[PDB]
Amino acid sequence: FMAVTANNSQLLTWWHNTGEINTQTPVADGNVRQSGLYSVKVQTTPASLYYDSFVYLAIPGNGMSDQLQYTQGYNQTQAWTSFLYSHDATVKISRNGSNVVIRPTSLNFPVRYDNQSVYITVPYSPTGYRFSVEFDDDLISLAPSGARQPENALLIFASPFENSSTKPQPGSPNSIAPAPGRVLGLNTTSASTVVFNPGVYYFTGHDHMVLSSSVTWVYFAPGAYVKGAVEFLSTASEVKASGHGVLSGEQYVWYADPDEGYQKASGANNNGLRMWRGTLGNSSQTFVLNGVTVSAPPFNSMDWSGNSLDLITCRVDDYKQVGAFYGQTDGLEMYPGTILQDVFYHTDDDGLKMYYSNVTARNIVMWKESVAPVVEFGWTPRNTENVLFDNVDVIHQAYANAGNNPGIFGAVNNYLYASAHSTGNSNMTVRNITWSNFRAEGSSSALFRINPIQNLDNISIKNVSIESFEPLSINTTESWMPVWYDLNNGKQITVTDFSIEGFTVGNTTITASNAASVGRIDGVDPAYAGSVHYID
Numbered sequence: 001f002m003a004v005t006a007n008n009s010q011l012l013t014w015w016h017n018t019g020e021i022n023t024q025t026p027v028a029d030g031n032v033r034q035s036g037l038y039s040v041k042v043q044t045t046p047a048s049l050y051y052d053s054f055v056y057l058a059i060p061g062n063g064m065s066d067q068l069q070y071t072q073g074y075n076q077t078q079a080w081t082s083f084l085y086s087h088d089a090t091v092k093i094s095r096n097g098s099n100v101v102i103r104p105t106s107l108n109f110p111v112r113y114d115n116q117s118v119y120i121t122v123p124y125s126p127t128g129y130r131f132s133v134e135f136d137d138d139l140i141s142l143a144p145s146g147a148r149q150p151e152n153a154l155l156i157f158a159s160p161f162e163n164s165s166t167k168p169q170p171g172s173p174n175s176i177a178p179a180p181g182r183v184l185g186l187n188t189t190s191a192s193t194v195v196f197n198p199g200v201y202y203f204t205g206h207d208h209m210v211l212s213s214s215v216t217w218v219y220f221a222p223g224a225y226v227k228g229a230v231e232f233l234s235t236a237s238e239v240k241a242s243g244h245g246v247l248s249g250e251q252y253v254w255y256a257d258p259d260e261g262y263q264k265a266s267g268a269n270n271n272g273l274r275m276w277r278g279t280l281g282n283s284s285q286t287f288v289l290n291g292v293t294v295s296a297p298p299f300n301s302m303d304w305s306g307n308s309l310d311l312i313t314c315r316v317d318d319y320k321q322v323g324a325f326y327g328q329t330d331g332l333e334m335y336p337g338t339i340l341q342d343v344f345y346h347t348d349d350d351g352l353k354m355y356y357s358n359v360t361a362r363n364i365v366m367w368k369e370s371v372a373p374v375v376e377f378g379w380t381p382r383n384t385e386n387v388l389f390d391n392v393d394v395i396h397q398a399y400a401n402a403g404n405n406p407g408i409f410g411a412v413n414n415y416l417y418a419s420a421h422s423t424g425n426s427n428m429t430v431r432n433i434t435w436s437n438f439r440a441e442g443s444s445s446a447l448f449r450i451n452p453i454q455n456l457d458n459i460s461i462k463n464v465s466i467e468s469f470e471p472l473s474i475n476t477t478e479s480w481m482p483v484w485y486d487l488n489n490g491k492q493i494t495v496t497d498f499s500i501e502g503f504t505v506g507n508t509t510i511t512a513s514n515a516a517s518v519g520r521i522d523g524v525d526p527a528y529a530g531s532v533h534y535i536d
Ligand SMILES: *[C@@H]1O[C@H](CO)[C@@H](O)[C@H](O)[C@H]1NC(C)=O
Pocket: 007, 013, 014, 198, 222, 223
């Protein structure tokens, strides 16, 4: 076996010669964990060469069996492949040894079969696609929900070619290109651009990619696999991470604290290593994040340093988070003004963190694991306004109990304190929030579980479809919204103009009269019953 990879104007695929098939221990430092189950090839249409595409594999604990306690305890693994394209292509999947379902199910790609292979015709789109290929005979039941999911997931990331804004042109100035292996000196380099060409790089579990203050761009080539985590020291007007390679946190222990020797943090200090971190002075910065796959975060995926987060905005496109089997593996922060689109999230904690104003997020595919809501706007009261989240397909959920804080639209209790609902702020308001075209495939948690820790005004749910609910038994499916009060003066928190439209469960539209019985919306406090409107 030697692989043949495409590199033409229509298709680009890649391989790694240090691929290691391994499902229980850490791979060698210079090796890349490879699926032993799935083999993928790609061929531009029409059908008259098939080129090999590397199938990466992430596993719970990353081979560190002593870290499995910090996962949900399932035996699921997650394989994925990426390729670049500019024309319709056929993806050919073979198994080392049944019909498939493609999620999101709205995609409707043609699927064909022969003796030993599955063929998926992926049409070209300028924003690409991110999807799951789910073999019927590989599905298992995840207790206690009974959610039916791949034991061995295969994710397909078809992306458009890289242009001069996401790939440094050849002959680019002041660029450094580290050689494969241990990467050193990037924290003190005078380069402005760091280029990771195809190959394997690592920082070990006791270091990370601290980028010097002159670095404004890190590029992960397709075929580059980097073991590490990114921290920009530059306070410049733009910092950029781009390219279609992988940044993998697999060498870090869960909750690794870079200020305590990268050992597991002492007592939940929230100083766990982020996959993306940046630094602000007293002027504006834009974080551009494009193309990259992040795998196996040891903690929250991202946070910027400083106490002046209005100065940061994000522009995120064609980005993936995979193999996030650990707890507290949050999605990105979306700072004020952020535009985020065409993203894949595997997450076992808060997915879409609606913490900041003037944000637009669209075309998101989410594999929610077992903890935290899809959308989060609790923890701390905020002034937050003018948000659109549109076209979010939650292709799986696997909650277990109420303590997981389940739900599509959630705002959990106040973090500084957890009588129960009396630490709100009546002086703060969340306004003009639109959540539109959400799909929950398979069994789902509740539509919403919202603590109004500050006032709510003009919140619109428009088109949300739930295929089915998780069992009543596990207390994850009833929606609620209890009355809250102000911390200092006991003034009641208000909820105003909260509308629900186009909400279905199965093929049944939810109205005022069946909201409780069919939609399981049975916990709206009487104080807010007049503020919640069913348009139908
Ligand atoms: C594909 O070819 C381009 C030059 O056209 C080169 O920059 C790139 O590294 C190649 N990619 C792979 C995966 O071989």
